[PDB]
Amino acid sequence: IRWTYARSANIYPNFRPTPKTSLLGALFGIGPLFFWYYVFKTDRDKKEKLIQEGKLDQTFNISY
Amino acid sequence: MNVLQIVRDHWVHILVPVGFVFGCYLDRRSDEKLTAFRNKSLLFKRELRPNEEVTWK
Amino acid sequence: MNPFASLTLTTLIILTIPIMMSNSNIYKTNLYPNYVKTTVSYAFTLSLVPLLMFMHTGQEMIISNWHWMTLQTVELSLSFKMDYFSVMFIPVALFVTWSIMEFSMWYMHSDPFINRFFKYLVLFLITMMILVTANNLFQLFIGWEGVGIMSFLLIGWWHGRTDANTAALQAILYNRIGDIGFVLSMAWFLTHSNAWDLQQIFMLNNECPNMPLIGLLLAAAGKSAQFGLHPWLPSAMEGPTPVSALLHSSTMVVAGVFLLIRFYPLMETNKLVQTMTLCLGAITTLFTALCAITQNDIKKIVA
Amino acid sequence: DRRFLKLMRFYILLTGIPVAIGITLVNVFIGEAELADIPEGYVPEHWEYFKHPISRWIARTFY
Amino acid sequence: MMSGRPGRVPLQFLPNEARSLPPPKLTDPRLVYMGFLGYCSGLIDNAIRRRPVVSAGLHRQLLYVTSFVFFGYYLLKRQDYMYALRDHDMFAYVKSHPEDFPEKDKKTYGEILEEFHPVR
Amino acid sequence: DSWDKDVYPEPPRRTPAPAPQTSLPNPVTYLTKIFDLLVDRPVTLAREFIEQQHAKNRYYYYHREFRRVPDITECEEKDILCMFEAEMQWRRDYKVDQEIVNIIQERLKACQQREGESYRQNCAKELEQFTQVSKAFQDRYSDLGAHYSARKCLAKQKQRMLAERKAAKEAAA
Amino acid sequence: KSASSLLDLIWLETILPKTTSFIQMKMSIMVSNQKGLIKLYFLSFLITIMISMTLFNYHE
Amino acid sequence: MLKIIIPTTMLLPMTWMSKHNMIWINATVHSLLISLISLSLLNQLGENSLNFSLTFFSDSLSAPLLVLTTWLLPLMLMASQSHLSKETTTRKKLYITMLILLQLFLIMTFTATELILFYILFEATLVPTLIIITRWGNQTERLNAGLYFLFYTLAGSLPLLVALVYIQNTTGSLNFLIIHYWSHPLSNSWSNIFMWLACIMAFMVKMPLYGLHLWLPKAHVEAPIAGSMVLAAVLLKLGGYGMMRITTILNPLTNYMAYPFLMLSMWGMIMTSSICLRQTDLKSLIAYSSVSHMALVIVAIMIQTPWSFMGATALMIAHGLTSSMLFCLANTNYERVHSRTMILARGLQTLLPLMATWWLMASLTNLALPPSINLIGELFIITASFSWSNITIILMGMNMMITALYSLYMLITTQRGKYTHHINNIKASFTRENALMALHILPLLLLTLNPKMILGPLY
Amino acid sequence: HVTKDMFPGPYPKTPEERAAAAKKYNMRVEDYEPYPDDGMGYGDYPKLPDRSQQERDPWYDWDHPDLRLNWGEPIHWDLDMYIRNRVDTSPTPV
Amino acid sequence: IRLQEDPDPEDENLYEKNPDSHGYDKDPIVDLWNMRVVFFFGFSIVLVLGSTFVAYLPDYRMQEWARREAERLVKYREANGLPLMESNCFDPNKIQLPE
Ligand SMILES: CCCCCCCCCCCCCCCCCC(=O)OC[C@H](COP(=O)(O)OCCN)OC(=O)CCCCCCCCCCCCCCCCC
C-alpha cells in the first residue's frame, strides 16, 4: 500500500512545475492534439475541394 | 392463518399494482384533455359510424 | 435444390448440439469426449453428401435463412456463401479435427477438465466453418474474432503457465493488428461499395479496391502469420500439442489467406495490389524457413 | 455454484416451456393472417392489420 | 408589470371581476400537490419533536393539510386571475394598436429559399 | 411463389439432361431418392397437417393505406398543423426509398449468384438500373444528416434546382 | 509517465480544478479576513462615495 | 406515460413503510415489476414519437434508456445487499429512497417534452448521487469525490440554463417538437458560436471529454458499489440523450467547430485506453475504459451522421451495461479482500471458477465481439467516421489496439493465473453475485439477436 | 497498522529523512537511492534498477512466485511495467 | 488511547452460520426466500416472458409496411416503364423556384 498510494496519490503533493514538466506536458498534451488537428483539418478540406465541382465518385455512396 | 398478521406482514405489496392502475387512469384522463382534432387529422378523417362515437378513446 | 443446402446446414446445426448439451450438462463426464468425437465424425460423413453434389453437378448456391435488420439501404441478413470453396473445405477440416481430437483424448487424459477442453474444441469448429460459409463480410468477421479470442482461451488451457498467458497477448495483439484492416476494408466497403455480402462486394466489380485489399492483406498478416505478425505461432505452441496441432498447424491460420482467395474476383484486379502480396509472402518464406533451419524443438519447425 | 446454475435454468424453463409450447401452438393451431381487400363496409381495427396471432393479440390489448 | 393598473384596489386578495373566471377545481393537480405539501409538513413536525412520524398527532396532521389546501385554493384563484388579467390587456393592446403589430403575409416553403447545409 | 416476377424477376430454369455412359451406379441420385422418402415425406405430412388446421380458420389482414397529404411546398411557413402531415409523408417516403434500393439490391444480389460467371453480362441491365436508382436516391437524400427534415430535403432539392436551372440558361448560350 | 503522472494526475488536474480552486482560496483571505478596527471600515466607505460620485460618476 | 412514473413515486411510501426484514425483499419484488411495466415503452412508431401528454413523451431514442434505468434499479438493490447489511433499518430505508428517487428523476428526465423540464430534471440527479457518493462511500477521499462531481457538472450546467432561456425568449418555445419543426440554422456569428459553446459544454463535461474527465476516476473509484454502477451505466448518458436532442438547431456551426472536440475525443480515447492499461487499481480501469468508449460516442454526435447516431444509442446501452458487470465483479473481489488492487488477488478461477466465467464473457463483451450490439454500434461509428474522414480509422483503430490489451489484462491477473497462498479470506460465491451477474449479462446477448429496438431513432 | 508514515511524503532532502525514508521502505540506509526530484512526483520512492519479475531467481521460495514477490520487501514503482507477463529486463547471450 | 474506538468488526461470513446461505440476509428462511424472489420474476418473467414480448412487437417501426409497399410501388412504375423513384419528389409543378 506504500506503492499504491505512491503511484496515484503522492504525485501532486510532490509535483513541482519545472520547465521540463511543462515541455513534456506540451509535447504529450496540446502537442499531439495539434498533430491530429492539422492532419484531420487538411484531408477534410481536401475532400471538400473534391465535391463542389464534381470530381468525387458517389456511384454507390447512398448511405450517408 | 390470522387475518391481522397477514396484514401486518403482507400489505405493502397490494399497493404497488393499484398505484400503477391509478396511473393508467390519468393516462386515460389525459387523453380526452386534448381531443382537439377529433376525426379531422388528414390521414384519419374516416367517416363516422353510428355504432361508435369517434375513432378512438 | 432439395438436397445440398439442407444437408450442410444440418452439419452446422448438429455439432452445435454438443455445446448446448454441455451447458445443460447432460454429458456424464468421460462420455462427452467420445460423444463429441461421434458427432464430429457424422458431421464429416454427412458433409460428403453435399460434396458429392459438387463433383457431379458442380452447382453452388447462397442461403439467406434470416434477416437481422435493415440499415435503410443495407439489410443485414444471415447469408451463407455456400460454394465449392465452402463445401469441400468442410469435410477436410473437421475430419482433421476429428482425427486430432482422438489423439488429444489419449494425450489429454489426466487433467480433470477433459469435458471443458473437448467442448472448447467443439465451439472452435463452429466459428471456423461459419467463416468459410459466411456470405456477408460481417459474418466472416464474427468468426474472425471467434477463432481469435478462442485461440487465446485454448492456448491458455493451463492458467498455471504465465508464458501461455503471455503467448495469448501477442496472439490477440497480432490478430487484432490484422483485423484493423478488416475494419478498414469494412469501412471502405460500407462507404464506397456500401455492402457486406461477399457476393455483393465482388459483383459491384470494384476494380480499384486499393484500401480494401490493403486491409485484407493486413488481415492475413495476423491470421495467416505473415512477416511482422509471425511470432505469435512461435508463441501459440505453448498451448497443448493437440490444440496447437488443431489450431496452429493449418486449420485456422489459413483463414486469413482464405479470405483473400474468397476476395479473388477483386483480389487480383489491381496488378500493383498483387505485387506487395508477393513481397509480403516472400519475406515470410525466407524468414520463417530460416528460423526452422535450426530449432531445438518439434513444434517451431512445423509452424 | 452448481445449485445456482441448475435452478436458474429451472426457473427459466419453468416459464419458458409454457411460452415455448404456446408459440408452437399458435402457428400450428389457429393459423396466420393473409392479405385481403376491405369491402368498404367494416371499419378495420388497429390490431387487425397485423400478421401473427400474438402480434394482433398484443396490439388488441396492450396497444 | 401591474401595480399601476387603473381601478386596482391594493390590499384586496381577490377583486370582484376575478369571480368571472373558472374557479380552480378541487381535484386540480396543483391544489392536491399543495395538500401533499401540507402532508410533508406533518412528517417533519413529528420528526423534530421525535414523535411517531406516521401515527402521532393525526389531529396536527389534519390541520397541517387543510390549512395548506385552503390557502392553496385562494392562491390559485389569484394565480389564474393575474394570468387572465395579463392576457386581457394583452389582447386589448393588440386590437387597439394594429399598426405596430404587422401580420406578414407568410408564404409556404415552396416560395422561400432556405439554404441547405451539406453535412458530412 | 407468394411473390411475383414483376417485382422479383428471376432467370428461367434451364437444366441439363445427363447421359450416364459410364457403368458405376450414380451415388448422388440414390442419395436424393433416400432423402425425399426418408426426410421429406414425414415432415411433409406434418406440413400437410399444418395446412387444413390453418384452413379451419383463416383470419384476413388488409393493407394499411394513407391518403397523400399536402406537401411542405404547399405547407404554410412556420405553420404547425399541416407541417405535421407533410413531415410525416416525407419520412414515410424516406423509409419507402430505402426499401426500393433494398429491393434493387436484393434483385442485384440474386442476379449475380443465380447467373454464375455469366452475371458480368447477365446483370448488365441489372447493374445499370441500380446506378439510376442510387444516383436519384442521392438527389432525393444526401448530406441530410441524422436530423433530416422535409424542409431540409426541399432546401437540398431547391439548391440543386436553381443550380441546374441557371446551368440550363447558361447552356442556352 | 506521460499518461498519469504528467498529464492526467497532474496537468489536466492542475489547470482547471486546482488552479481555479486555488484562486478562490488565494484571494478569499484578502477579502474575507479584515482587521476589525472601526476606523478603516468607514474609511473604506469614503472612497466608495467619490468613485460612485466622481470616477464613474453614476450621476452622469 | 404515468404508467411508470407514479408507481416509482409511490415506491417511497412502499420501502419506508415496509417491515424490518423484507425492505430489500420488498424493494426488489416490486422494482422488477416496474421493469416489465417500463418494458412496455418498447412500442415505437416509425418516426413520430410516443407523445403521451403535454409534458411527457418518449421516442425510439429515450425508450431503451428508460428500460435500462428501470431494470437497473433492482440490480443495485441486490448489489447493495452485502455492503449495507450491518447498517440500521432507518438508513436502509433512506438509502433505497435515494436509489428510487434517482431512478425517478432519470425516467422523467429522459421523457420530458420541454427542454427546461429536461434541464431541471437533468441536474436534479446529482443531488441524490451526491448523497450516495459522499455519505455511503468507503475510502477517505470520498469527501473530495463529491465536490469534484457536482462542481464539474454544474460548471457547464449553468451556461446551458442561460442559453436555454435565451432560446425561449428568441424562438418562443423550448419544446422538442416545436424546436425541431421550427429548427433554424445557427449562424457563424461570434455570439452564436458562444451560444453553441453554451449548449454543448454542459453535456461535454459529463460526457466526459479528455481533460474534463477527472471526476469519474475520483468518483467512481470511491463511490459506493451501488452508486458506482449507476453513475457509469446511465448517469453518464443524460448528456448524450440531451446531445442528440439539442443538436437539431446548432447546425451548421457544429460541422465547423466540432474539430477541437473531435480532436480531444480521438486522442483522448487512445490516451484514456493506454492509461487504462497502466493503473494499479482495477476500479480505475472500468472508469478509464468507460470514458474511452464514451469518448467514442461524442465523435458519433459531432459528425451527426445517421450511422453515427445508430451506434451512439447502441454503444450507450452496451457500455452502460458493460461497466455494470465489471463494477459488480470488481466489487465482488473488494469486500472479500477489502482492497481494489488487481495485484493483490490473481487467478481467482482456481478458487471461484463460476465468477471467472462471468468475468470473461463480460470482458469479451467489452471487446466488442460480434454479433453483440457492443460491436455493431461501435462499428457504425467507424463507418460514419470513415465517411467523415477515411484517415479517422488509424487513431480509432489504435483504440482496437488498447482495449483488449487491457480488457483481457485484468483477467490474466485477477481471474486467471495462480493464487497467493496467504488469502484464506476468499470463499465460495454467494448465489446473489452470480444471480445479479445473470441479469446483468444475459440481456446483452438477448437483444443482440434483435438489435433494431436499441439501434435508435434512425431506423 | 498504517497511519501516516509508510506512504511517501516529501522528497527526503536531508540525510535524516533520507534514513527515515530508507527505514520507511524497510531498506538499508546506504542502498537507499530516492527517485530524482524534479517535477516527477515520486519523492520518497527509491530508484529501482531495471530488474523484471521474469529476471528474478525462479528457484527462490518467493511468497508470490506469480511475479516472484515476497512479503514486506520494497516494490518497484514500475513493478507492473516489468512483470513476467509484460516486458522483461533479463540478460541475453549476445 | 486517544480516540476511544471499537475494534474493527470482522466480516460476517453468511455460510458459516447457515451453510446454505445466499448472500441475502442472516436468517435462512428469508435467505432462501430472497432467491425465490429474484429467481422468480427477475429471470422468469423479465427475461423469458419479457423476451417474447420484445421479440413479438406488433410491426415495430412498420418496416414490413414499407416492405410490402416497396413491393407494391415498384411494379407500378415498372409496369408503365417509369424509372421507379425520381431524382426529385416535390415535383417541379408546385414549387416556386426563385425568379
Ligand atoms: C396480491 C396480494 C399480495 C400480498 C398479500 C398476499 C401475500 C401472500 C402471497 C402468497 C405467498 C405464498 C407463499 C407463502 C409463504 C409463507 C411462509 C411463512 O409462513 O412465512 C411467515 C414468516 C413471517 O412470520 P409469521 O407470519 O409470524 O409466520 C412465522 C411464525 N414463526 O416469514 C416471512 O418472512 C413471511 C414472508 C412471506 C412472503 C410471501 C410473498 C409476499 C409477496 C407476494 C406478492 C408478490 C407480488 C406482488 C404483485 C402481485 C400482482 C402482480
Q: Residue H428: which region, alpha, beta or left (left: phi > 0; alpha: psi -120 to 50)?
A: beta
Question: What whole-number distance in Å separates Cα of residue C256 and Cα of residue C259?
Answer: 5
Which amino acid would we find at residue G18? K
Q: CA of G29: how far to CAs of C136, H144, J76, in Å?
A: 69, 22, 82
Which grid cell is I45?
Answer: 520512492
Question: What whole-number distance in Å separates Cα of residue J70 and Cα of residue J10?
Answer: 69
Around Cβ D57, how many Cβ atoms within 10 Å?
Answer: 16
CA F113 to chain centre: 17
Examine residue H252 and say whether the peptide bond preceding it is cis (omega within 30 degrees of 0).
Answer: yes
Helix extents (H) in chain G: 12-13, 19-31, 38-50
Pairing of strands H50-51, H57-58: antiparallel
Q: CA of H457: how far to CAs of C170, H307, H426, in Å?
A: 40, 11, 46
Question: What whole-number distance in Å separates Cα of residue E5 and Cα of residue G40?
Answer: 48
Which grid cell is B19?
Answer: 398505484
How many degrees, rounded to 5, is the angle at CA A61 between CA A58 and CA A63?
155
Question: What whole-number distance in Å separates Cα of residue D13 and Cα of residue D23?
Answer: 14
Question: What whole-number distance in Å separates Cα of residue F73 and Cα of residue F43?
Answer: 57
Which grid cell is H386?
Answer: 470513415
How many degrees, rounded to 5, is the angle at CA H276 between CA H273 and CA H277?
95
How many degrees, rounded to 5, is the angle at CA E27 between CA E24 and CA E29?
85
Q: Residue C148: helix, strand or coil by DSSP?
A: helix
CA F122 to chain centre: 19
- Give me the count of residues in chain J: 99
Q: Residue H141: helix, strand or coil by DSSP?
A: coil
Pairing of strands F60-62, D34-36: parallel
CA atoms within 13 A on the CB side of C55: 10
Closest CA to C267 of C218, C228, C222, C210: C210
Would you call A60 an interface residue with chain C, using a CB distance cutoff of 8 Å? Answer: yes
Q: What is the distance between the terminal CA atoms of chain A, rounded to a whole angstrom? A: 53
- Which of H216, H269, H275, H406 to mutate against chain G (most G CBs within 10 Å)? H275
Question: What whole-number distance in Å separates Cα of residue H237 and Cα of residue A1?
Answer: 34
- Residues H309/G35, Cβ–Cβ less than 8 Å: no
Q: What is the dihedral of CA F74, F80, F85, F90, to 10 degrees?
A: 70
Q: What is the DSSP annotation of C244-287?
A: HHHSTTTTSTHHHHHHHHHTHHHHSSSHHHHHHHHHHHHHHHHH
Which grid cell is I15?
Answer: 540525510
Around Cβ H307, how many Cβ atoms within 10 Å?
Answer: 27
Closest CA to C247 of C176, C157, C159, C138: C157
Diameter of chain G measured on Cα atoms: 60
Closest CA to C191 of H384, H441, H202, F124: H384
Q: Residue C66: helix, strand or coil by DSSP?
A: strand
The b/e string for I54-93 (b: 16+ C-beta within 10 A; e otherwise) is bebeeeeebebbbbbbeeeebbbbbbbebbbbbeeeeeee
Pairing of strands F60-62, H50-51: unpaired
Which grid cell is H148?
Answer: 469534484
How many degrees, rounded to 5, is the angle at CA H80 between CA H74 and CA H82?
130
Residue A9 is given by DSSP the state: T
What are the two backbone dihedrals, phi and then psi, of residue B44, each rounded to the nearest 5 degrees?
Answer: -125, 55
In sequence order, the 6+-apart residues with CB closer than 8 A to the CB of I79 are A3, H343, I53, I67
CA H393 to chain centre: 25
Examine residue H371 and say whether the peptide bond preceding it is cis (omega within 30 degrees of 0).
Answer: yes
In sequence order, the 6+-apart residues with CB closer than 8 A to the CB of H311 are H297, H300, H376, H377, H378, H379, H380, H381, H384
Q: Taken in order F22, F25, F26, F29, is the CA torsion positive or negative?
A: positive
Which grid cell is H120?
Answer: 431541471
Closest CA to H386 of H313, H311, H451: H311
Q: Residue H209: helix, strand or coil by DSSP?
A: strand
Distance H20 CA to ligand 1 centre (A): 14
Which grid cell is C28?
Answer: 456424464
Query: Is C300 exposed, middle or buried, given 0-12, 13-18 or 19+ CB atoms closer than 10 A?
Result: middle
Distance B13 CA to ligand 1 centre (A): 9
Subunits with 3+ C-beta pairs closer than 8 A to A: C, E, F, G, H, I
Would you call E100 an interface residue with chain F, using a CB distance cutoff of 8 Å? Answer: no
Around Cβ C163, how many Cβ atoms within 10 Å?
Answer: 13
Distance J45 CA to ligand 1 centre (A): 19
What are the two backbone dihedrals, phi and then psi, of residue H58, each rounded to the nearest 5 degrees?
Answer: -145, 160
Around Cβ F64, how many Cβ atoms within 10 Å?
Answer: 16
In the block, residue with C-alpha cell 438509502: H95
- Residues F41/F62, Cβ–Cβ less than 8 Å: no
Question: What whole-number distance in Å separates Cα of residue F103 and Cα of residue J84?
Answer: 12
Question: What whole-number distance in Å separates Cα of residue I65 and Cα of residue I57?
Answer: 10
Neighboring chain D residues of F50 at a CB cutoff of 8 Å: 27-28
Residue J74 is given by DSSP the state: H
Residue F60 is given by DSSP the state: E
Around Cβ C183, how many Cβ atoms within 10 Å?
Answer: 22
Q: CA of J5: how far to CAs of C73, H91, H141, I1, J9, in Å?
A: 69, 22, 21, 15, 11
Q: Residue F15: helix, strand or coil by DSSP?
A: coil
What are the two backbone dihedrals, phi and then psi, of residue I34, each rounded to the nearest 5 degrees?
Answer: -65, 160
Question: What whole-number distance in Å separates Cα of residue C142 and Cα of residue C126?
Answer: 11
- Residues H142/H218, Cβ–Cβ less than 8 Å: no
Which grid cell is J84?
Answer: 421507379
Question: What whole-number distance in Å separates Cα of residue C108 and Cα of residue C101?
Answer: 9
Around Cβ E63, how many Cβ atoms within 10 Å?
Answer: 14
Q: Does the C-beta of B19 come closer than 6 Å to ligand 1?
A: no
Residue F170 is given by DSSP the state: H
Distance B11 CA to ligand 1 centre (A): 9
- The Cα of G49 is separated from the nearest Cα of chain A by a number of Å equal to 44
Question: What whole-number distance in Å separates Cα of residue B20 and Cα of residue B22?
Answer: 5
Residue A63 is given by DSSP the state: -
What are the two backbone dihedrals, phi and then psi, of residue C67, each rounded to the nearest 5 degrees?
Answer: -125, 120
Question: What whole-number distance in Å separates Cα of residue F171 and Cα of residue F168?
Answer: 5
Question: What whole-number distance in Å separates Cα of residue H392 and Cα of residue H383?
Answer: 10
Neighboring chain H residues of G13 at a CB cutoff of 8 Å: 214
Q: Residue H229: helix, strand or coil by DSSP?
A: helix
Q: Residue H178: helix, strand or coil by DSSP?
A: helix
Q: CA of F84: how far to CAs of C23, F71, F79, H47, H185, in Å?
A: 53, 10, 9, 12, 20
Q: Residue D35: helix, strand or coil by DSSP?
A: strand
Around Cβ C208, how many Cβ atoms within 10 Å?
Answer: 13
Q: Does the C-beta of J37 come closer than 6 Å to ligand 1?
A: no
Subunits with 3+ C-beta pairs closer than 8 A to C: A, F, H, I
Q: Residue A46: helix, strand or coil by DSSP?
A: helix
How many degrees, rounded to 5, is the angle at CA F25 between CA F22 and CA F27?
120
Helix extents (H) in chain A: 2-8, 11-14, 19-28, 30-51
- Residues C198/C140, Cβ–Cβ less than 8 Å: yes
- The Cα of A27 is separated from the nearest Cα of chain C by a number of Å equal to 26
Judging contact as 3 or more Cβ pairs under 8 Å, the answer for F and J is yes
Q: Does the C-beta of H29 come closer than 6 Å to ligand 1?
A: yes
Which amino acid would we find at residue H5? I
In DSSP terms, which residues pair with F146 in a beta bridge? none
Q: What is the DSSP annotation of J22-68?
A: -SS-SSHHHHHHHHHHIIIIIIIIIIIHHHHHHHT-TTGGGHHHHHH
Subunits with 3+ C-beta pairs closer than 8 A to J: D, E, F, H
Question: What whole-number distance in Å separates Cα of residue C267 and Cα of residue C263?
Answer: 5
- Residues C193/H386, Cβ–Cβ less than 8 Å: no
Closest ligand 1 atom to residue B5 Cα is: 26
In DSSP terms, which residues pair with D36 in a beta bridge? F62
Which grid cell is H139?
Answer: 475510502
Q: CA of H378: how far to CAs of H34, H259, H272, H299, H319, in Å?
A: 30, 20, 17, 11, 10
- The Cα of A30 is separated from the nearest Cα of chain H by a number of Å equal to 9
Would you call J69 an interface residue with chain F, using a CB distance cutoff of 8 Å? Answer: yes
Distance D22 CA to ligand 1 centre (A): 30
Q: Does the C-beta of B14 come closer than 6 Å to ligand 1?
A: yes
Around Cβ H125, how many Cβ atoms within 10 Å?
Answer: 23
In the block, residue with C-alpha cell 388497429: D46
Which amino acid would we find at residue D15? T
Judging contact as 3 or more Cβ pairs under 8 Å, the answer for I and E is no
Q: Residue H39: helix, strand or coil by DSSP?
A: helix
Q: What is the distance between the terminal CA atoms of chain B, rounded to a whole angstrom? A: 45
Q: CA of A26: how far to CAs of A54, D3, G12, in Å?
A: 41, 57, 12
Query: Is I21 exposed, middle or buried, given 0-12, 13-18 or 19+ CB atoms closer than 10 A?
Result: buried
Q: Taken in order I65, I66, I71, I72, is the CA torsion positive or negative?
A: positive
- Quick one: angle between helices C162-191 and H373-388, nearest 10? 50
Which amino acid would we find at residue F117? E
H or E element that contains F31: helix F27-35
CA atoms within 13 A on the CB side of C79: 21
Which grid cell is F36?
Answer: 425425399
The b/e string for C42-65 (b: 16+ C-beta within 10 A; e otherwise) is ebbebbbbbbbbbeeeeebebbbe
Which grid cell is C105?
Answer: 483424448
Give I16-22's long-range contacts (Cβ < 8 A, gap of 24+).
Answer: I21/I46, I22/I46
**Chain H / chain I CB contacts < 8 angstroms:** 17
Question: What whole-number distance in Å separates Cα of residue H89 and Cα of residue H196?
Answer: 48
- Which of D15, D37, D55 to mutate against chain J (most J CBs within 10 Å)? D15
Q: Which of C62, C75, C199 sits opposite F102 (nearest CB)?
A: C75
